[PDB]
Ligand binder design. Structure first.
Ligand SMILES: [K+]
Ligand SMILES: [K+]
Ligand SMILES: [K+]
Ligand SMILES: [K+]
Ligand SMILES: [K+]
Ligand SMILES: [K+]
Ligand SMILES: [K+]
Ligand SMILES: [Mg+2]
Ligand SMILES: [Mg+2]
Ligand SMILES: [Mg+2]
Ligand SMILES: [Mg+2]
Ligand SMILES: [Mg+2]
Ligand SMILES: [Mg+2]
Ligand SMILES: [Mg+2]
Ligand SMILES: [Mg+2]
Ligand SMILES: [Mg+2]
Ligand SMILES: [Mg+2]
Ligand SMILES: [Mg+2]
Ligand SMILES: [Mg+2]
Ligand SMILES: [Mg+2]
Ligand SMILES: [Mg+2]
Ligand SMILES: [Mg+2]
Ligand SMILES: [Mg+2]
Ligand SMILES: [Mg+2]
Ligand SMILES: [Mg+2]
Ligand SMILES: [Mg+2]
Ligand SMILES: [Mg+2]
Ligand SMILES: [Mg+2]
Ligand SMILES: [Mg+2]
Ligand SMILES: [Mg+2]
Ligand SMILES: [Mg+2]
Ligand SMILES: [Mg+2]
Ligand SMILES: [Mg+2]
Ligand SMILES: [Mg+2]
Ligand SMILES: [Mg+2]
Ligand SMILES: [Mg+2]
Ligand SMILES: [Mg+2]
Ligand SMILES: [Mg+2]
Ligand SMILES: [Mg+2]
Ligand SMILES: [Mg+2]
Ligand SMILES: [Mg+2]
Ligand SMILES: [Mg+2]
Ligand SMILES: [Mg+2]
Ligand SMILES: [Mg+2]
Ligand SMILES: [Mg+2]
Ligand SMILES: [Mg+2]
Ligand SMILES: [Zn+2]
Lengths: 154, 99, 43, 150, 305, 118, 110
RNA sequence: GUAAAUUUAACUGUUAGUCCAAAGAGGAACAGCUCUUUGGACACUAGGAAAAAACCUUGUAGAGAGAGUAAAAAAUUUAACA
RNA sequence: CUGAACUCCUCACACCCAAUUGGACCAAUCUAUCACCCUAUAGAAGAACUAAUGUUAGUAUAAGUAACAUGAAAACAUUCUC
RNA sequence: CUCUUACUUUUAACCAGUGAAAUUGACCUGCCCGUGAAGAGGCGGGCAUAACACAGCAAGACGAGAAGACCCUAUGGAGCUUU
RNA sequence: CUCGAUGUUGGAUCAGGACAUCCCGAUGGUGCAGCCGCUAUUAAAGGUUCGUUUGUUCAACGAUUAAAGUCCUACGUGAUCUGAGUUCAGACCGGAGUAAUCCAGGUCGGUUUCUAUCUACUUUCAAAUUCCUCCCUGUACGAAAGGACAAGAGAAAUAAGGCCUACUUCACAAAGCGCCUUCCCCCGUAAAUGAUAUCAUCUCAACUUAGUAUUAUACCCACACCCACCCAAGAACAGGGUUUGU
């Protein structure tokens, strides 16, 4: 039974899980886009979002600095978190990352995901786009919308 | 081996089938199988069960006649048994003698 | 329930066999033939 | 065994014997070696028996072919198209006579299991039995427990 | 031949519009049923001995303690009636059973996730689809017109009810957890045998009897708790406070019915029949109904004098 | 009219129908009387089932059997009936069903004493 | 516990060819509009994703040349500028990674 | 009434036995027990006694979509009294 | 009345017992002489395999089962975790 | 131990790659009572019964493994002791 | 029957069945006043304890209990466990033997394999038993001593099925040491009216009453949105939710 168990069991145990997730997060901060097994990316995504919130507290908050020191194994990335990544999201309250499934890995057919910090300088991912508003179905619904709005104003 | 021994069962099963079919036809006329077969013999009618079963299926009017004949001979038997010898032999009870 | 000890038709305790009406008639039928044989062997 | 082989119903070729009898054997092809020992009995059959057998059956064309062969054979063909090949290897003259006569008398139909030892196209003269054959009719054909004129 | 879902082909602009449109229709349909007695109700017969009325479908909110005036603590389970409406009536003749039945449904769900046959059924009824539908055996005098809303005040404090729900699903479980088998000793030599069934049958029969207790799927089946006392009714939020615990997890749907226990037979003489009509009610009920023995939150502290 | 079958002797009390659910303790034995009140067609159905040949055709034959406890027969079944079979047992008449002609025809066999309190 | 008898091919074919064992047909395969290669509805197109990765790898190699060592991450934002382009007003104060190729059409300048 | 028998010549295999009826012995007037005797059956066919080596019917060999038979089915129901 | 491989019926007949014993045929092979799309009369012999936990080789069953393996990201440079 | 519970790792199950072993007369391989070389999935009488996977279990297949090591037999061995 | 192997004591685990009933139910008799007993008929739904020594089955003893039942199931159950005992190879004591060795003796030590092919089975879904306290009552009974039954009220234990408010182990949850719910019968006899047999007679006489359940009711019940995501659902599959598909 695993009712309400929100964390996955990966690596060699609880400590190894954190270390595995930490290495993924460190890579993400440096490169701003990485690919890894889908389950591991999904697990790390929560930590990648919260790291930005700690970065927004500022480099003068000693608690934030300790959190960043632990989670970023390469110390040149700690200035980037506080001075590059966190200012970029100054006007957002969340949704700093986007996660998309990519084709299964060749060797072991593992389910794979790409994760990136929004607003990076890298070539954009081929994001899934919704159907145009000009399609047959969307035009029939636009007519229905127009009609309802006209009947309400009357 | 089964094919060899089955030749006995084939003959046995065929005769069982004829008796079942003759029994059915006899009951349609209110006669039990032993009454029909027994009394037909007493009329010197030597039709075997294979032919009797065929007649029941394909010659139903002849079979009713045979059933009627057996029924008549059966009633003649009763009349004779009830009598003390005063009565002459039944018309259908007379046996044709050969020499 | 209702087992016969050992084999059915041998030994101390056996399955009881009963004489049917037709078994009796069969025996009597052959007794009559032998009785007549006695007669024809008397002369 | 019966289950392991085909079967057929008793039949004839063109209702043979109904208006007239027609011999079904149509052709006989013998192959008798001049020198083979196995063909010794076949050579003696060709010297005294085949000619007298042809006189009796003028509707059968007999083809005697003398050629080198290790196994002499007779091939019988029938009007219905059946072809039968029977070996006469090392058979006596009397044995061959019996075989040849048997082929003359056969219809040519397959020598397989016959389901019934009889055949008829008119099994019934008085009407084939059906469930109403011996049932009495009822006034106005009323069914059991049926209210009339309600 | 490829599968589709409701917003697969919708554009960015149309997805919010469609959500708002269908949401408003659901709310309007629910509001249109709030006056059952003004919409040609069926005959409201008086209660008679031997009469069986409809029950409710409620969601299990959780558990809460309450104390009685004698000082005793009783835990209760809160059951909230969420969009409960009568759906179908089947006559005794057509039921195929000894009694007529009334179908009740609870809790609104999305129309985009239901089968077409179900959607057309709800279209004719004029209600949004319900998550769970349950069948209540009733007497002819207790029939209610399909579409009538049902409320928590259908039940009253002091009544006893039975609650049926699916138990918590524990998946595949061993005999120890599933059946309470003792298992085997921890030490003193045991070889790879601590939680195992042991012997499952005798040697003679050379088989395993049907019904033999073995490892397998545990829970996630319907169970019924009988004779639970209704301590309190919150009419504003439509919550029923029921004694003790009920089967299932919090936020599951439960079937609430009058208790069938011999001792509680023919206690509906004073209960709403065929149901509670708040619109018909002459005097609005207070926000909370309390059983006489319950300590109300604002009552003075207990003193034993 | 399978509800109105009649057993000879004391078969109502003595004849037992045995079944087993398959579970431990599942052996069940009920008298003919108990079964009849539980299922008014069971007795006739079981009697027929046991007489049919013990082969795979039996259950097909049972599909052609239509048992009804009373005198109500569905209209469809009633419409397809062809012939009614004679009842195998002649039902004996009760003393109240005899006509006065029949009663008068049977002689009085003995003369009771005039001074006897019958 | 050993097999008490050999399993027949008739039995084995029933087990092996049971519908549960068979491969299920996929109904979520669709054509990619950008490139025309097949893709799954919920998965990014492999062809398009590979193209993006190839350009990303080239840019990352250029970033490495500018960094010229480990632990040299910049403290400012970065902008990739292709041949024939100059920094905009919004690109001032950002490390400029120059690519010796024409800007890809799918890659939109911002 | 029947057709075998002895002798001469030349050999092999069998020499670890079961039940049934009958006369007995041992045992416990136990054993599907053990030991002799007389006979049968089995270790060969087929039918019957529910299934069935040993009980009953029956043997000599093939084909038949004829026929007459053999053995062959379990019966029973109860306590008033001067 | 049913009911056998008993008996009769049409036709045919060497054609239902272990060990053992007598007899009639015979596959293929080689040789002599024939034969010459595969045979004949004889003479010979490593002369016939549904069974030895047989020998060798092939391929199944168990079974696609038991079991086995590669720390992480990345520009493949490098760095990080242990 | 009363009396067990929770969590981690391994194993496990699913996907991908690779891929053994004992075992196997043939099997279209149910249950009850009875029978029988004396303890029946296969016989008699009943009952039950569309077809086919996956995961568990160990009551039966007198389950697999080893031509019983106990016991007896063989004019079969061997070691040791000895008037 | 089995020696080309049917694993051999007691225990653990799980129990299936018989009734010749240990306890609980219903009755007859009594040298049955009552309270306790004795004996017989009926009843197998439910129940039938924990410890010290001993490998023990038993037995003895301590403390309990409504009661600590008798048996069968390959002396049930080792492809589920255990190995103290018994029953190899080491050794000691007593005894036997010239010795090698031996003993229905005692004593210390001594390897318990198996990946499940087939059969069978894996939620017989839901009516429960019992003790005690109070009361009846110091009443019926009896010379006294002693001392009930039925009815009623409550409170518990066990069993079954659930649950997490608190407590506890714990901490998005799973658990017990915690909490909640739990509903019919059962036939042995005792009596009327009344014939054979004009009294009488409870009747394998016709019949009436105690005296019975068509076990009641409950639960379950609508189903080409379904690629994908989430889940109190879950090995896989399946199931619920997405009006929560940036
Ligand atoms: K015996
Ligand atoms: K017999
Ligand atoms: K715990
Ligand atoms: K097993
Ligand atoms: K042995
Ligand atoms: K099997
Ligand atoms: K009397
Ligand atoms: Mg892992
Ligand atoms: Mg015959
Ligand atoms: Mg026996
Ligand atoms: Mg669960
Ligand atoms: Mg334990
Ligand atoms: Mg071990
Ligand atoms: Mg262990
Ligand atoms: Mg001798
Ligand atoms: Mg003969
Ligand atoms: Mg002969
Ligand atoms: Mg030859
Ligand atoms: Mg040889
Ligand atoms: Mg060979
Ligand atoms: Mg071999
Ligand atoms: Mg396997
Ligand atoms: Mg594995
Ligand atoms: Mg490993
Ligand atoms: Mg496994
Ligand atoms: Mg695999
Ligand atoms: Mg073997
Ligand atoms: Mg048996
Ligand atoms: Mg077997
Ligand atoms: Mg074995
Ligand atoms: Mg041996
Ligand atoms: Mg020697
Ligand atoms: Mg063996
Ligand atoms: Mg038990
Ligand atoms: Mg008793
Ligand atoms: Mg044992
Ligand atoms: Mg073991
Ligand atoms: Mg075992
Ligand atoms: Mg030991
Ligand atoms: Mg010594
Ligand atoms: Mg010892
Ligand atoms: Mg030691
Ligand atoms: Mg196992
Ligand atoms: Mg009292
Ligand atoms: Mg009286
Ligand atoms: Mg009187
Ligand atoms: Zn593409």
């Amino acid at each position: 039974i695993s009712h309400g168990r929100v964390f996955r069991r990966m690596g060699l145990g609880p400590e190894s899980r954190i270390h595995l997730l930490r290495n993924l997060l460190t890579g993400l901060v440096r490169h701003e886009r990485i690919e890894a097994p889908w389950a591991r990316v999904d697990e790390m995504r929560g930590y990648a979002e919260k790291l930005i919130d700690y970065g927004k507290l500022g480099d003068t908050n000693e608690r934030a600095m300790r959190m960043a020191d632990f989670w970023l194994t390469e110390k040149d990335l700690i200035p980037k978190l506080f001075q590059v990544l966190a200012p970029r999201y100054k006007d957002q309250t969340g949704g700093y990352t986007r996660m998309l499934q990519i084709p299964n890995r060749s060797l072991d057919r593992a389910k794979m995901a790409v994760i990136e910090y929004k607003g990076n300088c890298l070539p954009p991912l081929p994001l899934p786009r919704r159907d145009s508003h000009l399609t047959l179905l969307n035009q029939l619904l636009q007519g229905l919308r127009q009609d309802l709005r006209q009947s309400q104003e009357a | 081996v089964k094919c060899t021994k089955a030749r006995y069962l084939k003959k046995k099963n065929m005769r069982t089938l004829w008796i079942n079919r003759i029994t059915a036809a006899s009951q349609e006329h209110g006669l039990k199988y032993p009454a029909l077969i027994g009394n037909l013999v007493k009329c010197q009618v030597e039709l075997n069960r294979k032919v009797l079963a065929d007649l029941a299926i394909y010659e139903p009017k002849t079979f009713k006649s045979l059933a009627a004949l057996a029924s008549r001979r059966r009633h003649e038997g009763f009349a004779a048994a009830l009598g003390d010898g005063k009565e002459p032999e039944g018309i259908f009870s007379r046996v044709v003698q050969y020499h | 329930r209702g087992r016969i000890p050992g084999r059915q038709w041998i030994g101390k305790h056996r399955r009881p066999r009963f004489v049917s009406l037709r078994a009796k008639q069969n025996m009597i039928r052959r007794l009559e033939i032998e009785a007549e044989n006695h007669y024809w062997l008397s002369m | 065994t019966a289950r392991g082989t085909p079967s057929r119903f008793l039949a004839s070729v063109l209702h043979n014997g109904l208006g007239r009898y027609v011999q079904q054997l149509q052709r006989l092809s013998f192959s008798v070696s001049r020198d083979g020992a196995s063909s010794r009995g076949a050579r003696e059959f060709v010297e005294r028996e085949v000619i007298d057998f042809a006189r009796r059956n003028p509707g059968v064309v007999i083809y005697v072919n003398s050629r080198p062969c290790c196994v002499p054979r007779v091939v019988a063909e029938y009007l219905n198209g059946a072809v039968r090949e029977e070996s006469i290897h090392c058979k006596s003259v009397e044995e061959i006579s019996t075989l040849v006569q048997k082929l003359a008398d056969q219809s040519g139909l397959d020598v397989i299991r016959i389901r019934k030892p009889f055949h008829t196209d008119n099994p019934s003269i008085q009407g084939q039995w059906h469930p109403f054959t011996n049932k009495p009719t009822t006034f106005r054909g009323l069914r059991p427990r049926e209210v009339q004129d309600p | 031949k490829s599968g589709t879902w409701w917003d697969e082909h919708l554009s960015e602009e149309n997805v919010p519009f469609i959500k708002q449109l269908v949401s408003d229709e659901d709310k309007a349909q629910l509001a249109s049923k709030l006056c059952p007695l003004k919409d040609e109700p069926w005959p409201i017969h008086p209660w008679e001995p031997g009469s069986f009325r409809v029950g409710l479908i409620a969601l299990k909110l959780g558990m809460m303690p309450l104390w009685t005036k004698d000082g005793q603590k009783h835990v209760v389970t809160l059951l909230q009636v969420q969009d409960c409406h009568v759906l179908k009536y089947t006559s005794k003749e057509n039921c195929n059973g000894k009694m007529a039945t009334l179908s009740v449904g609870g809790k609104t769900v999305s129309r985009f996730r239901k089968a077409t046959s179900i959607l057309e059924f709800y279209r004719e009824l004029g209600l949004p689809p319900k998550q769970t539908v349950k069948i209540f055996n009733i007497t002819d005098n207790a029939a209610i017109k399909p579409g009538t809303p049902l409320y928590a005040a259908h039940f009253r404090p002091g009544q006893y009810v039975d609650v049926t729900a699916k138990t918590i699903g524990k998946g595949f479980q061993g005999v120890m957890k599933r059946w309470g088998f003792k298992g085997q000793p921890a030490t003193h030599g045991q070889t790879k045998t601590h939680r195992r069934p042991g012997a499952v049958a005798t040697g003679d029969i050379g088989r395993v009897w049907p019904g033999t207790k073995m490892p397998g799927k545990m829970g996630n089946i319907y169970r019924t708790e009988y004779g639970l006392k209704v301590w309190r009714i919150n009419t504003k939020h439509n919550i029923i406070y029921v004694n003790g615990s009920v089967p299932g997890h919090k936020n599951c749907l439960v079937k609430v019915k009058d208790s069938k226990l011999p001792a509680y037979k023919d206690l509906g003489k004073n209960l709403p029949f065929p149901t509670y009509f708040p619109d018909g009610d002459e005097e609005e009920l207070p926000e909370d109904l309390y059983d006489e023995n319950v300590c109300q939150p604002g009552a003075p502290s207990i003193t034993f004098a | 009219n399978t509800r109105h079958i009649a057993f000879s002797g004391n078969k109502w009390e003595q004849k037992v129908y045995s079944s087993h659910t398959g579970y431990p303790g599942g052996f069940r034995q009920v008298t003919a009387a108990q079964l009849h009140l539980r299922d008014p067609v069971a007795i006739v159905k079981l009697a027929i089932y046991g007489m049919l040949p013990k082969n795979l055709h039996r259950r097909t034959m049972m599909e052609r059997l239509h048992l009804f406890p009373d005198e109500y027969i569905p209209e469809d079944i009633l419409k397809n009936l062809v012939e009614e079979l004679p009842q195998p047992r002649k039902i004996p008449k009760r003393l109240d069903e005899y006509t006065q002609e029949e009663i008068d025809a049977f002689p009085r066999l003995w003369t009771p004493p005039e001074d006897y309190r019958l | 516990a050993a097999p008490k008898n050999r399993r027949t091919i008739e039995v084995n074919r029933c087990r092996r060819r049971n519908p549960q064992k068979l491969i299920k047909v996929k109904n979520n395969i669709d054509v990619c509009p950008e490139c025309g290669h097949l893709k799954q509805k919920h998965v990014l197109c492999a062809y398009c994703y590979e193209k993006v990765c190839k350009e990303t790898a080239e840019i990352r190699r250029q970033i490495g040349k500018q960094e010229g060592g480990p632990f040299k991450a910049p403290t400012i934002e970065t902008v990739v500028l292709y041949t024939g382009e100059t920094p905009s007003e919004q690109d001032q104060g950002k490390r400029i990674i120059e690519r010796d190729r024409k800007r890809p059409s799918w890659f939109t300048q911002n």
